[PDB]
Short mmCIF file of C-alpha atoms and ligand atoms in Angstrom, two decimals:
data_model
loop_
_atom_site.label_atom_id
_atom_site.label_comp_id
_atom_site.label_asym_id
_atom_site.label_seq_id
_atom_site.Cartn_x
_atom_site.Cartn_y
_atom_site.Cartn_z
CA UNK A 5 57.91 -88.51 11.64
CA UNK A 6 57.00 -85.07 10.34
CA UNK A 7 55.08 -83.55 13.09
CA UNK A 8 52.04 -80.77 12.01
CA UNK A 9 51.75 -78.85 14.84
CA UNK A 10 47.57 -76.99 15.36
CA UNK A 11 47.82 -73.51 17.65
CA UNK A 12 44.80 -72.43 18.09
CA UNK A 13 42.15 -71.51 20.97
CA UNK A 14 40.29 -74.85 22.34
CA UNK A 15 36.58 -73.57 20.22
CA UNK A 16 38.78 -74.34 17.31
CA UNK A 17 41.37 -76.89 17.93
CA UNK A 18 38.09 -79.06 19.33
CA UNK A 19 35.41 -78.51 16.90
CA UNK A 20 34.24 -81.19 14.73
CA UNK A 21 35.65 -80.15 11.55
CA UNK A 22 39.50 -79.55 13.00
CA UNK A 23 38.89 -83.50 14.82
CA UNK A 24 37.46 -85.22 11.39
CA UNK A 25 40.74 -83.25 9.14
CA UNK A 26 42.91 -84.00 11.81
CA UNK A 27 41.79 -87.77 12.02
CA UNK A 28 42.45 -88.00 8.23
CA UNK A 29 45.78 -85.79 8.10
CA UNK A 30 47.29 -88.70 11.14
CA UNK A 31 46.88 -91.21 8.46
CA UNK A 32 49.71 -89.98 6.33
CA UNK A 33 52.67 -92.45 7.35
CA UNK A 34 54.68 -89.93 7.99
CA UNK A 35 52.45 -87.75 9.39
CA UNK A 36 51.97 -86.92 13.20
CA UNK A 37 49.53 -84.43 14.45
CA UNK A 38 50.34 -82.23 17.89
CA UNK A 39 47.48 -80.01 18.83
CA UNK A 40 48.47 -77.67 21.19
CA UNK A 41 46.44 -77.34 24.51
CA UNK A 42 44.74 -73.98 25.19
CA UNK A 43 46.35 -73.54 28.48
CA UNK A 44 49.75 -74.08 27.43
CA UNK A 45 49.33 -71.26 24.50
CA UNK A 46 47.80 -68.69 27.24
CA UNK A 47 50.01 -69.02 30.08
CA UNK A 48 53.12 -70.88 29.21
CA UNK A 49 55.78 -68.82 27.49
CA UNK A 50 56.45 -70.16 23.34
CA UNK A 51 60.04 -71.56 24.48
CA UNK A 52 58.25 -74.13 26.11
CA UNK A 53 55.56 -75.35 23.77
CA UNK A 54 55.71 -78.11 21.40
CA UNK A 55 58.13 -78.12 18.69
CA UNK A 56 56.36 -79.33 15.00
CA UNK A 57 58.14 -79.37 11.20
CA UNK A 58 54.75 -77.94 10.53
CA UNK A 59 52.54 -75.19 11.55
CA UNK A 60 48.76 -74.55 11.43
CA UNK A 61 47.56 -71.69 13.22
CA UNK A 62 44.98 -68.71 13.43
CA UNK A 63 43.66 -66.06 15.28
CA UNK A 64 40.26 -66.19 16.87
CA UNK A 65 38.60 -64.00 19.59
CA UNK A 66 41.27 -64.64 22.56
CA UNK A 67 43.91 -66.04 20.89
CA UNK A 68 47.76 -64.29 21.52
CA UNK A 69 48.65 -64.07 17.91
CA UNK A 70 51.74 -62.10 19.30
CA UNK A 71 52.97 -65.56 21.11
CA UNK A 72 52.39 -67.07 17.57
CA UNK A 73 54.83 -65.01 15.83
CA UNK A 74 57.61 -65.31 18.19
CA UNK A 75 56.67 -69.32 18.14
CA UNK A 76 57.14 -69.11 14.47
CA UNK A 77 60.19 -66.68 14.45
CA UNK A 78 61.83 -69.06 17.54
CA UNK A 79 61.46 -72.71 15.85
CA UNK A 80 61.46 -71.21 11.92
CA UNK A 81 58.56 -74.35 11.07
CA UNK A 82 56.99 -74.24 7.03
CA UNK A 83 53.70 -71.89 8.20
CA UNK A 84 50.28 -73.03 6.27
CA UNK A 85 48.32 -69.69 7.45
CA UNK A 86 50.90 -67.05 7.41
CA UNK A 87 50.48 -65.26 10.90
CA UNK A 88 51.94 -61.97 10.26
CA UNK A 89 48.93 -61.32 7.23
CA UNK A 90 45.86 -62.14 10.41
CA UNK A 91 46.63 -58.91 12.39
CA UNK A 92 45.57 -57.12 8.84
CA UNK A 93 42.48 -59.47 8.18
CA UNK A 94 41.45 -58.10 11.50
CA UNK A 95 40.80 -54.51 10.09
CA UNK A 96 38.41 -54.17 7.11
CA UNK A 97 40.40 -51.11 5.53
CA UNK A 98 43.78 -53.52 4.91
CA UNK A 99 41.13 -56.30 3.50
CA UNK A 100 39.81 -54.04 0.83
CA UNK A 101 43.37 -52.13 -0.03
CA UNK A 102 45.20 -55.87 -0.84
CA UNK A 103 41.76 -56.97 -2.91
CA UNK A 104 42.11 -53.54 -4.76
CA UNK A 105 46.21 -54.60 -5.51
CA UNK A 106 45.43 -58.04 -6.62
CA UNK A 107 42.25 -55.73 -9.20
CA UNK A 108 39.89 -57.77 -7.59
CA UNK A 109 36.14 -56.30 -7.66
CA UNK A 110 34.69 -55.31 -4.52
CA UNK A 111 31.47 -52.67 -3.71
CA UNK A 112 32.65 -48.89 -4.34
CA UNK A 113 33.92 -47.69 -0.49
CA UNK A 114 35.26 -45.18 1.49
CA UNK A 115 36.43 -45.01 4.88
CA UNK A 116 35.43 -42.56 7.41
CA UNK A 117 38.09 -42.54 10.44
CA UNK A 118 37.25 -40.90 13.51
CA UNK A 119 40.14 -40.11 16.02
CA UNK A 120 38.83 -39.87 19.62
CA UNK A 121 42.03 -37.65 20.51
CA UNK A 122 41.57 -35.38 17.46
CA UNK A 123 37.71 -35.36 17.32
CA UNK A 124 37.11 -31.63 16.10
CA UNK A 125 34.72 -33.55 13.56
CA UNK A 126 34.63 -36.05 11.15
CA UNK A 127 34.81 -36.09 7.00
CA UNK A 128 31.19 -37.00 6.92
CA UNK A 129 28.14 -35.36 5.15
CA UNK A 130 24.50 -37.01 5.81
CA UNK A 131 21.27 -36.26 4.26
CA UNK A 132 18.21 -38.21 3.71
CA UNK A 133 18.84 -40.34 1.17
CA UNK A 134 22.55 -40.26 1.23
CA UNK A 135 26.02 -39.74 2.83
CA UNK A 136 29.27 -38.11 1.57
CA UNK A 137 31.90 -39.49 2.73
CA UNK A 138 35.21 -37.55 2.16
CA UNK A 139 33.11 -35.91 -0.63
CA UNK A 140 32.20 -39.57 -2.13
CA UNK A 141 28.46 -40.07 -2.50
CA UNK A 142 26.74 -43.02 -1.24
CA UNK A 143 22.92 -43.27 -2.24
CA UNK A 144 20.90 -45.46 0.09
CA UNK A 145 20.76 -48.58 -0.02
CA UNK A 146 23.79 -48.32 1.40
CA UNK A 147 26.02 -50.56 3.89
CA UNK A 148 28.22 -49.45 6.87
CA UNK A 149 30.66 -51.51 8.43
CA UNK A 150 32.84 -51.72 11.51
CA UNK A 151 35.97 -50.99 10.47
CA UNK A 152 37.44 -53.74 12.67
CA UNK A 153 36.48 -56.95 11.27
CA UNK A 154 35.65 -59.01 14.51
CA UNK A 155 32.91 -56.24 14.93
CA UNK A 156 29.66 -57.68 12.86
CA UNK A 157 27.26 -54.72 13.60
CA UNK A 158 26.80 -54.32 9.93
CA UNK A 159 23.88 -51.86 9.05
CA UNK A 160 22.22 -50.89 5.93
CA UNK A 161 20.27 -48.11 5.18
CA UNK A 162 16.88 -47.98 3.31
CA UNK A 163 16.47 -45.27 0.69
CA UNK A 164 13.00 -43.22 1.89
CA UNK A 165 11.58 -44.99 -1.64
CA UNK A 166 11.52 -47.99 0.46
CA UNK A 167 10.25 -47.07 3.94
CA UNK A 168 13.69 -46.18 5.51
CA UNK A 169 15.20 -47.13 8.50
CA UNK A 170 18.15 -49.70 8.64
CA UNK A 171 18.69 -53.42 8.96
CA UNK A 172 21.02 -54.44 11.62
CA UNK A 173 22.69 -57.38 11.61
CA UNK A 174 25.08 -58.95 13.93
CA UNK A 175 26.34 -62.63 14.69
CA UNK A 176 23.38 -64.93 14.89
CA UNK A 177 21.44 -65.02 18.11
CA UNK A 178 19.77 -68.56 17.26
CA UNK A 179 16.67 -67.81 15.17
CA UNK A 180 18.03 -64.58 13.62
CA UNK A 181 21.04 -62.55 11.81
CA UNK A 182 19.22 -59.06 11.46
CA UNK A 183 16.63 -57.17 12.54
CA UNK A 184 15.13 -53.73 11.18
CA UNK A 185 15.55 -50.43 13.21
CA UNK A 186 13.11 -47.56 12.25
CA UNK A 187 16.59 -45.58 12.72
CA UNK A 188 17.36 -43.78 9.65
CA UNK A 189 20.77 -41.61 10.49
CA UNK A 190 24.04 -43.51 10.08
CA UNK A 191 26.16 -44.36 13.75
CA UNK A 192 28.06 -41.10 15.06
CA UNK A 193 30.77 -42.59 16.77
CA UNK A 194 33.33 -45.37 15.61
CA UNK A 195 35.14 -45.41 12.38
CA UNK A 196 33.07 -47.11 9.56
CA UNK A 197 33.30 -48.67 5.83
CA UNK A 198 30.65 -47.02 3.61
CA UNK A 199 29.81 -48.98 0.22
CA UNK A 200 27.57 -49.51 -2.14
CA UNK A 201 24.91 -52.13 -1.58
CA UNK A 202 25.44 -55.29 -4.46
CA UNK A 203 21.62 -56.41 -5.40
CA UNK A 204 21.81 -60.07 -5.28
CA UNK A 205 19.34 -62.96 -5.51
CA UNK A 206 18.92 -62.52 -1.53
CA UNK A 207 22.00 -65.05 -1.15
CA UNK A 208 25.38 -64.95 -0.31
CA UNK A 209 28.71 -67.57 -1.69
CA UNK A 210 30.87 -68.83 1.37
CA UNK A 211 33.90 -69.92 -0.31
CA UNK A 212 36.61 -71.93 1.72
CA UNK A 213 39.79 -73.00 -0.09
CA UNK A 214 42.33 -75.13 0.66
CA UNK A 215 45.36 -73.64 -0.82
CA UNK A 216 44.69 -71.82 -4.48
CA UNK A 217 43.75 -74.84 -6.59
CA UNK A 218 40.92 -76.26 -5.07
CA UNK A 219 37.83 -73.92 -3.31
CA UNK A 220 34.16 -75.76 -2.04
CA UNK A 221 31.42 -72.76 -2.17
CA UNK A 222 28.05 -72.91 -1.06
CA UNK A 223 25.39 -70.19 -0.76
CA UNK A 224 23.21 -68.89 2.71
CA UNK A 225 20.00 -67.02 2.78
CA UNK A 226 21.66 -63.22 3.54
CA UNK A 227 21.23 -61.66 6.42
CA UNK A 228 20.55 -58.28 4.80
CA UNK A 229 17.03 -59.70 3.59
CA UNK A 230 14.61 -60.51 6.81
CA UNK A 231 17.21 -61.72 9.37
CA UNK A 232 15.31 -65.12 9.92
CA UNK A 233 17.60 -67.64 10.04
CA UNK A 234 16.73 -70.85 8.00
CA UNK A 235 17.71 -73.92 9.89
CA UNK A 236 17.09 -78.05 8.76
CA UNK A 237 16.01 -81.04 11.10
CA UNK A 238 19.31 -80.86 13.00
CA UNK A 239 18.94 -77.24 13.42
CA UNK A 240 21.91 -76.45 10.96
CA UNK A 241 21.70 -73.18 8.52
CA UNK A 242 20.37 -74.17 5.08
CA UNK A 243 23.49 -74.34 2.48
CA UNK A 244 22.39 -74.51 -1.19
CA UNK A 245 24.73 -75.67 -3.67
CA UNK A 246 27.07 -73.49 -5.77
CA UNK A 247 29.71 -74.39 -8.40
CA UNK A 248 32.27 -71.12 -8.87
CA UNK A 249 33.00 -69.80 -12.52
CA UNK A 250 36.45 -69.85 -13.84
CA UNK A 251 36.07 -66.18 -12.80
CA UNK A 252 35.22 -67.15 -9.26
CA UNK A 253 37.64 -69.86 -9.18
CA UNK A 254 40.73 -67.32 -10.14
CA UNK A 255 39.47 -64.70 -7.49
CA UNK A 256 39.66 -67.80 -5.23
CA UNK A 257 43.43 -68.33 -6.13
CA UNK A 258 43.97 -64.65 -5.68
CA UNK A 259 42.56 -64.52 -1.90
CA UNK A 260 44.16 -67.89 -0.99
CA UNK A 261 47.92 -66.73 -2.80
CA UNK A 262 47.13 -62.65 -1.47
CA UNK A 263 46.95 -62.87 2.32
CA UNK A 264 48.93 -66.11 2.53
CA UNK A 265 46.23 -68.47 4.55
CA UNK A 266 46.40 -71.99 2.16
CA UNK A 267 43.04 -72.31 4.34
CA UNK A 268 40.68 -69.66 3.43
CA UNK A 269 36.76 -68.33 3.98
CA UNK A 270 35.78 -65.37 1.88
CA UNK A 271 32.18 -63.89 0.77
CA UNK A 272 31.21 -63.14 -2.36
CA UNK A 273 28.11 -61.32 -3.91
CA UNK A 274 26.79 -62.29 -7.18
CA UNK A 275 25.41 -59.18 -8.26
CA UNK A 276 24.86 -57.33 -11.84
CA UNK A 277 26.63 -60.38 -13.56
CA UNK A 278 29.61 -59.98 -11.69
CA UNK A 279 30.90 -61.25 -8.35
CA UNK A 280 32.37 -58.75 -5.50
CA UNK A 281 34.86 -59.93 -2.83
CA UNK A 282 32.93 -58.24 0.22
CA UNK A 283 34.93 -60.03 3.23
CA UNK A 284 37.81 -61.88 4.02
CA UNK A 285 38.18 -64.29 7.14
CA UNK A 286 41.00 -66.68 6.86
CA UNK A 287 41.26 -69.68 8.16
CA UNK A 288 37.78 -71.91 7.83
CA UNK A 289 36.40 -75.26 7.41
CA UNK A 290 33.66 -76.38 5.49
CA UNK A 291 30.82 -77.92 8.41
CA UNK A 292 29.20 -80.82 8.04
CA UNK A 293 30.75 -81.58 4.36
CA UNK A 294 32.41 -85.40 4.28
CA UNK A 295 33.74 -84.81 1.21
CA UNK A 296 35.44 -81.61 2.26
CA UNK A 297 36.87 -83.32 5.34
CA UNK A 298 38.47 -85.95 2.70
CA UNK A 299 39.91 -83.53 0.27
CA UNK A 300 40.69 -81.05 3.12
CA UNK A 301 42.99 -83.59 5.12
CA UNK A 302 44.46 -85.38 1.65
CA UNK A 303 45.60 -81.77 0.21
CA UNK A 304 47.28 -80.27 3.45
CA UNK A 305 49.15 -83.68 4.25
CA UNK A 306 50.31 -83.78 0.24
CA UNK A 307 51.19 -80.05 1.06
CA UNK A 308 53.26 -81.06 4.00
CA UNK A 309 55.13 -84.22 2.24
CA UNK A 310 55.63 -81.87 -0.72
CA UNK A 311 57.38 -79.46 0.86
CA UNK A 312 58.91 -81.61 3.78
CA UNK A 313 59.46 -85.11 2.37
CA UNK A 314 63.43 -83.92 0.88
CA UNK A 315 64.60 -82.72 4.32
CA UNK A 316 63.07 -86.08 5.93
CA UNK A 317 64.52 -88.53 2.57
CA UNK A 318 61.31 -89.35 2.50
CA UNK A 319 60.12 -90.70 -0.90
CA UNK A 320 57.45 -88.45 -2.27
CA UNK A 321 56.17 -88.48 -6.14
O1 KDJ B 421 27.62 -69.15 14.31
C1 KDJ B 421 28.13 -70.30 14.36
N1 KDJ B 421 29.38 -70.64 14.07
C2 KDJ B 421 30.24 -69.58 13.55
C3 KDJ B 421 31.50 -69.45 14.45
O2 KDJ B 421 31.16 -69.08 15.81
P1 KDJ B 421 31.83 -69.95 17.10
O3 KDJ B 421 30.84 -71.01 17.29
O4 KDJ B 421 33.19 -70.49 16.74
O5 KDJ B 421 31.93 -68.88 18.08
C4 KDJ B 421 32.41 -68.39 13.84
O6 KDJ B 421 33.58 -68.16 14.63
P2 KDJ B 421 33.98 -66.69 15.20
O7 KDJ B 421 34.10 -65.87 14.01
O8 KDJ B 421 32.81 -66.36 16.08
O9 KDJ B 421 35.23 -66.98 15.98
C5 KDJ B 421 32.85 -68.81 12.44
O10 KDJ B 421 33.46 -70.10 12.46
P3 KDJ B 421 35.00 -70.24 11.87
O11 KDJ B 421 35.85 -70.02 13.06
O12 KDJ B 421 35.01 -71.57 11.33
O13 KDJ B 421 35.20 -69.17 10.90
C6 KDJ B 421 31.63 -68.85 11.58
O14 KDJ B 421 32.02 -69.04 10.18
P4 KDJ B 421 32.49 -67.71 9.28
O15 KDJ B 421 31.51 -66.61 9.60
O16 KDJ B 421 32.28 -68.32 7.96
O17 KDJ B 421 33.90 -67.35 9.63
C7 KDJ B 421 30.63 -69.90 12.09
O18 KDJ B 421 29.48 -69.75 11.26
P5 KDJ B 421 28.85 -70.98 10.39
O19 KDJ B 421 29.59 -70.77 9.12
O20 KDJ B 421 27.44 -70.52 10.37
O21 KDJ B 421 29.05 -72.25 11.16
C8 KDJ B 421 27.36 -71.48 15.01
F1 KDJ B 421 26.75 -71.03 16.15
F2 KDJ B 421 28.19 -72.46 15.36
P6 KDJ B 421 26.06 -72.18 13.77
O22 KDJ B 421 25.67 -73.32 14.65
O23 KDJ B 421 25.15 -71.02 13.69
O24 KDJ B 421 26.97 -72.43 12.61
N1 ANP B 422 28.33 -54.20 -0.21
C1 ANP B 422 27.38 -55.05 0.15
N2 ANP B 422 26.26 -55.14 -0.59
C2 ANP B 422 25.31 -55.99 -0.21
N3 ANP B 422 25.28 -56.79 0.85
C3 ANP B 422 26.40 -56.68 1.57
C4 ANP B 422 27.47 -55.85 1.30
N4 ANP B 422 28.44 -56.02 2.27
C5 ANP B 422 27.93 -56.91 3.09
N5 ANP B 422 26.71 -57.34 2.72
C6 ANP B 422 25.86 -58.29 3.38
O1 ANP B 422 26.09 -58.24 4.76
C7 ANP B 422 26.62 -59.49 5.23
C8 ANP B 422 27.67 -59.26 6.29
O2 ANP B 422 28.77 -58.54 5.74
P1 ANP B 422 30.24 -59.10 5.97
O3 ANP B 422 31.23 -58.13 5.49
O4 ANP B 422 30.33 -60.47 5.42
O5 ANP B 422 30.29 -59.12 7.55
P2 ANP B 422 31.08 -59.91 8.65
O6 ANP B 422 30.67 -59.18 9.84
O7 ANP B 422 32.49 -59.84 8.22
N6 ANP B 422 30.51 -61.42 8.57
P3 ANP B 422 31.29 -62.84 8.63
O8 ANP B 422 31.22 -63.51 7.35
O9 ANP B 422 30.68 -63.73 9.61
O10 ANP B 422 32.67 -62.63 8.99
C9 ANP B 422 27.12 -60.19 3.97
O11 ANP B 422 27.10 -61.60 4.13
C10 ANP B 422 26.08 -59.73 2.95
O12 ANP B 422 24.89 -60.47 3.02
MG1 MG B 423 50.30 -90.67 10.62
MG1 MG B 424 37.56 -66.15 12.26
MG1 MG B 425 30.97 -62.31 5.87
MG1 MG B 426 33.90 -61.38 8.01
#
């Protein structure tokens, strides 16, 4: 059997999208899933976990992506998500400088970097209705992000024109994914993204692909409008359907090829008849899609007999 090994933290590894691929993936003949327990990736050194032909796995929050590495480098397995690219999707500045090599459109930015050992001051400008960052203008609206991309404190701030203050947003508490702050001055500590604010149709395109032929999008209310949450009878988010452009579809091949995850979640921003890469996240599933679980599961197990089945004489066509 080729064995497809899943490292990941238990959150992940025991969700209901991983168990419905993983289901579908063990019915490949030749196919045999090993998910590795949370315990054994925390506290038992990468010499003694399980050895696979194949490996799937991601950071999350609490994950030792370190371990990973040397797992990877140790037992040399064909990687799905390459591990060494997820310690730069962690930090928004090394998102945003591969989408600008791969000419991929993204909101005008600049960084501002504060060092908390060299702290004489900062690169940054503010007046009412704007910043300057490094001597680049930002007119409000504008958005500022974290600079580490685990951190989802993103604010925006209101041009006066509109009654000023800031939106806040952060991951969803249940009912809500922003709220607005009569605070008008941008944060004075941290290190930030500033960029331009994309007017869209007050939605934003998820787009998950499964290696750099085949993407599923679908659109949420954004979080930048009210900061309700819509949720349906089950109390899931609202999805509305999207089909991506053959525009959309090649920026999807350029994320998925780019940062070398096969399994991908980016967000884009339909805005001024254009779409902007504004985030990167790696490895995603689709929720709650059946179809997705089917396509999903058939197109990483072809993956895996494609690029196994030689080495195993197994016959693949
Ligand atoms: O917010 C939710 N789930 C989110 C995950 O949060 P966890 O439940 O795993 O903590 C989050 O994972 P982290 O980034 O927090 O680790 C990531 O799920 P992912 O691991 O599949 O990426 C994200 O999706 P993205 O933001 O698209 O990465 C998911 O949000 P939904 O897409 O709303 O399910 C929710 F509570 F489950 P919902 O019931 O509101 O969907
Ligand atoms: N330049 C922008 N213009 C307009 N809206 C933006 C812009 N950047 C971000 N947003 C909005 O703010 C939301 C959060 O920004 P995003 O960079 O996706 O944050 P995150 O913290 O990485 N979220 P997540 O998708 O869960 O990882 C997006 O979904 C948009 O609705
Ligand atoms: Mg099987
Ligand atoms: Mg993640
Ligand atoms: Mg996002
Ligand atoms: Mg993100």
């Amino acid at each position: 059997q080729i064995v497809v090994g899943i490292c990941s933290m238990a959150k992940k590894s025991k969700s209901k999208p991983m168990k419905e691929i993983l289901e579908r993936i063990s019915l490949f003949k030749y196919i045999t899933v090993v998910v590795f327990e949370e315990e054994v990736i925390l506290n038992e050194p990468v010499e003694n976990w399980p050895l696979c032909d194949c490996l799937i796995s991601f950071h999350s929050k609490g994950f030792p992506l370190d371990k990973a590495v040397a797992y990877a480098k140790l037992r040399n397995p064909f990687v799905i998500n390459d591990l060494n690219m997820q310690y730069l999707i962690q930090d928004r500045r090394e998102v945003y400088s591969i989408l600008q090599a791969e000419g991929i459109l993204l909101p005008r930015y600049a960084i501002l970097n504060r060092d908390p050992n060299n702290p004489k001051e900062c690169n940054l400008i503010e007046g009412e209705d704007h910043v300057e960052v490094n001597g680049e203008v930002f007119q409000k609206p504008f958005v500022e992000k974290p600079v580490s991309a685990e951190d989802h404190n993103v604010y925006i701030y209101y041009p006066t024109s509109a009654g000023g203050g800031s939106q806040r947003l952060f991951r969803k508490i249940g009912s809500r994914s922003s709220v607005y702050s009569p605070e008008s001055n941008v944060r004075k500590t941290g290190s930030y993204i500033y960029e331009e604010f994309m007017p869209t149709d007050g939605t934003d395109v998820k787009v998950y692909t499964v290696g750099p032929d085949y993407a599923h999008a679908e659109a949420r209310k954004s979080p930048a409008l009210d900061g309700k949450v819509e949720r349906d009878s089950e109390g899931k988010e609202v999805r509305y359907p999207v089909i991506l452009n053959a525009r959309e579809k090649l920026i999807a091949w350029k994320v998925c090829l780019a940062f070398k995850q096969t399994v991908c979640g980016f967000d884009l921003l339909r805005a001024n008849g254009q779409s902007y890469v504004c985030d990167v996240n790696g490895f995603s599933f689709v929720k709650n899609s059946m179809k997705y679980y089917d396509d999903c599961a058939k197109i990483l197990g072809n993956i895996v007999m494609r690029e196994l089945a030689p080495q195993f004489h197994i016959p693949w066509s």
